[PDB]
Amino acid sequence: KVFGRCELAAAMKRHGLDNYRGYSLGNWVCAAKFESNFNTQATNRNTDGSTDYGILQINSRWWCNDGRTPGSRNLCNIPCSALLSSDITASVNCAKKIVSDGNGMNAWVAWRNRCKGTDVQAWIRGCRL
Numbered sequence: 001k002v003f004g005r006c007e008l009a010a011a012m013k014r015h016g017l018d019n020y021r022g023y024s025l026g027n028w029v030c031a032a033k034f035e036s037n038f039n040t041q042a043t044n045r046n047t048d049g050s051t052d053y054g055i056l057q058i059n060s061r062w063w064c065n066d067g068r069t070p071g072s073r074n075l076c077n078i079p080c081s082a083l084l085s086s087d088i089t090a091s092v093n094c095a096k097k098i099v100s101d102g103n104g105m106n107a108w109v110a111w112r113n114r115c116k117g118t119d120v121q122a123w124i125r126g127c128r129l
């Protein structure tokens with residue numbers, strides 16, 4: 001599923017991400033834009049052999065199981081395929097664990113490089129929330 005911008009903001013808010021660990025909703029929408037262009041089926045292979053999955057491009061090195069990432073962990077206790085669903089619940093629940101791991105949203109390199117220090121509120125401007 002490819003979400004619309006306000007549609008995803010509303011879904012993220014419904015699942016408790018607005019101001020989760022202090023990160024306003026626009027931070028999460030911005031991150032999803034640049035990680036996946038709002039596409040739940042996005043996948044991308046990393047040079048270390050791990051793969052990133054879903055609207056927030058969650059990595060199999062640490063967070064999900066895909067059966068082909070040697071030596072990895074599955075700390076969200078989910079198959080990576082669950083992160084590709086049109087229902088964002090699994091992605092949101094795993095994102096809450098990631099953002100609580102110590103480094104906040106800097107866990108997403110694209111958030112640090114393209115959202116951090118910008119007007120992230122623009123990503124929810126105009127949306128009915």
Ligand SMILES: [Cl-]
Nearest residue numbers: 024025026121
């Ligand atoms: Cl915001």
Ligand SMILES: [Cl-]
Nearest residue numbers: 109110113114
């Ligand atoms: Cl980047």
